[PDB]
Design a protein around this nucleic acid. Structure first.
Lengths: 67, 65
DNA sequence: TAGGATTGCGCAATAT
DNA sequence: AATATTGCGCAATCCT
């Protein structure tokens, strides 16, 4: 009975739930995009640290090897 | 007119476009989530590398003493 | 069995 | 013209 009164309230409740679910998912996506930005900045920081330490170590090893 | 052949083909083509558009968005969102997993693992790897390089530096510097 | 959460899809207005 | 998006909503199904 798609004309019923009860039917309409059931549909209204689901429509409310749908918007809530969609909002939540779209927010989760936005949070995830933010996480990528955050993780990328951290990845760049770590890359820089690894390079710096690698050069420091290579220089020290060369010193010992030049004895 | 919903009986119009033009209408019928209009709906058929739009339904294809709507589905395509929605699949592309779901794909983009899944990739973004994937990148989080990727970067997380990579950052973990680099951190371990940082720690390893530091141990190697310490070991060598101990030779001075 | 009830009832909210998720998901896929259609429609039609609207944008490109 | 034709395809791409998107607000609104139906219905099935998943989850409590």
């Amino acid at each position: 009975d798609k004309h019923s009164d009860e039917y309409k309230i059931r549909r209204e409740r689901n429509n409310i739930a749908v918007r809530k679910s969609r909002d939540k998912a779209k927010m989760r996506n936005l949070e995830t995009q933010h996480k990528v930005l955050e993780l990328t900045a951290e990845n760049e920081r770590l890359q820089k640290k690894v390079e710096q330490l690698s050069r420091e170590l290579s220089t020290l090893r060369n010193l010992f090897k030049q004895l």
